[PDB]
Structure 1
Amino acid sequence: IKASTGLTGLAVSTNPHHTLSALYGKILRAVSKMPQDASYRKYTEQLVKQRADSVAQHKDITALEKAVGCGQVEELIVQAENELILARKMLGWKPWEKLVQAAPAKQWDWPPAQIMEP
């Protein structure tokens, strides 16, 4: 077993597969509640399922690390947890809807303060 995570605070965590699996399940359900025509949904399943499908083939934690890339398991679980909070907040945010506000004319125009031909 690796002695240290190389980072302060980030401690070595056992049963990573169980934790990663459990995290992937919850986020999948969290996106399950989403509407079926949300781009955020469309991609999270394929990404998460790709991860949650890679979780199994590599019993060795180091083997899984290489297979999944993207960093070490210790951070990787945190990545998953972050996204759990994202989905719960995302459902609460309803960002799949259309534009709340149209920018006023000449808002995002650079350079500023130049007369124009109508």
Structure 2
Amino acid sequence: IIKASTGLTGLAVSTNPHHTLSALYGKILRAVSKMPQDASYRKYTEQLVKQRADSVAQHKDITALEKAVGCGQVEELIVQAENELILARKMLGWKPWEKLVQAAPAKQWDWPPAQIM
């Protein structure tokens, strides 16, 4: 029981998608555990990856996992988890949870711009 092709070039089929997804989800938890608790991105990522990890651990079949997650095929789930792992590695250094780095200049976001007011 294996998929013949994904119908989508550049991504071959995965031999063990469940362990790859679980390892990427554990690495996302390890990257997000260094974030401060007051940051909303940590809570949102923890809720997402906990729901996805429960979906992976609850379902042993591949197409049942793809239906239960509902996002897409499981190789694209691996791609999404890798992208969110790269994001969770980067946002520790980008430091998003603080205040505004630059205040709003005067008449910067006014449309139409030529008025006296």
2:69 pairs with 1:68: yes
In structure 2, list runs of 5 or more residues that go unmatched: none
Deviation at 1:105, TM superposition (A): 1.3
Give me the whole-angstrom Cα distance separating, in 2, the residues matched to 1:51 and 1:93: 25
Aligned-residue offset at 1:58: 1.1
Determine the C-alpha separation between the residues in 2 that align with 1:25 and 1:44. 12
Q: Secondary structure of 2:83's partner?
A: helix
Q: Residues 85-117 of structure 1, C-alpha deviation per residue, up to 9 Å, x if partnerless?
A: 10110001001111011111110000011111x
> So what's the TM-score if we normalise by structure 1?
0.96
- When the two structures are superposed, what TM-score results if normalisation uses the length of structure 2? 0.97
Q: Which residue of 1 aligns with 2:85?
A: 84
How far apart are residue 57 of structure 1 and its match?
1.4
Q: CA deviation at 1:14?
A: 1.1
Return the alpha-carbon distance in structure 1 between the equivalents of residues 84 and 58 of structure 2: 23
Q: How much has 1:45 moved relative to structure 2?
A: 0.3
Quote the RMSD (CA, aligned, Å).
0.6
Task: Report Cα offsets for 1:44-64 as digits up to 9, x if no partner.
Answer: 001100000110111110000
Once residues 91 and 82 of structure 1 are traced to their aligned partners in structure 2, the CA distance between those partners, rounded to angstroms, is 15
